[PDB]
Each structure stands twice: as structure tokens, then as C-alpha cells.
Amino acid sequence: LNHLYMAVVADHSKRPHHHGQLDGVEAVQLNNPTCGDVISLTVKFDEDKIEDIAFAGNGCTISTASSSMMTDAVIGKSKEEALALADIFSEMVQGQENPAQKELGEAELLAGVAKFPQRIKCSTLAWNALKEAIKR
Ligand SMILES: [Zn+2]
């Protein structure tokens, strides 16, 4: 029942979702905890919502997985909705319990990074590139 989790996290790191870059969209680039992760996160908004999203970069398994899962979780949400999820994720990876972590989708599998301090920032990188993208 747990072996499936490894396959889901592995799939997000090896075959990222919403990977690459969107056309005609000024990307948002941030980088490392210290680990050496980087991401270019192009985000499209048609309304206040997120029409589409895409990312590219280089990181550890944790950081790539987390970027990939972040895209799934936020696609078609809202400056504020997306930003609330970011807060939810960020709090989850500091050991907080919250039923709302369900709204994170497969990113919920990264609850375990709260036990690895150096990994916190690996996992949040994508979320913070999102925060910046929304806030333009
Ligand atoms: Zn990392």
C-alpha cells in the first residue's frame, strides 16, 4: 500500500508534469536552498485563474517531484486559491496537521519532508516561484 507512493514520487521526479515552458510568457526563475535546485516557471492567467503552467530546471528528486506536483495542484485556481495552497504546503512541510492537505493532491506525499530540514526548501522552491508569478 506504500510501495505505490515511491512510484508516484519517482514518476514526478523522472517524468515531470507540466514540464517545459509556455510561449510568450515571461518566466519566473528562483534557485537553491543551497542544494543547487533551479526553476523557470512560466504561468498563464486568462482570467484571475491559471489557464496553464509549465516549469523547467534542475534539482534533487524531492525538488523536481515537488515542482511537478505543485503544477497539478494549482492549475486553474486563483491568485488567492493557489496562494492558500502554498501556505498549506509550506505548513505541512513544517510538521503541521491539517485536513486541507488533501487539496494539495499528490504533493500531499511530501508531508515526510518536515523530518528533513535541508529538504524543506527543496520542496518549497516551486511554490515560491508560483507566489512570485501570481503577484506578477
Ligand atoms: Zn534539493
UniProtKB/Swiss-Prot annotation:
Pfam families the UniProt entry points to: NifU_N
InterPro entries: NIF_FeS_clus_asmbl_NifU_N (IPR002871)
Gene: iscU
Keyword set, alphabetical order: Metal-binding, Zinc
Family matches, as NCBIfam families: SUF_scaf_2
Cited function: A scaffold on which IscS assembles Fe-S clusters. Subsequently gives the nascent cluster to other proteins. It is likely that Fe-S cluster coordination is flexible as the role of this complex is to build and then hand off Fe-S clusters.
Name of the protein in its database record: Iron-sulfur cluster assembly scaffold protein IscU
Family that this chain belongs to: Belongs to the NifU family.
GO MF entries: iron ion binding; iron-sulfur cluster binding
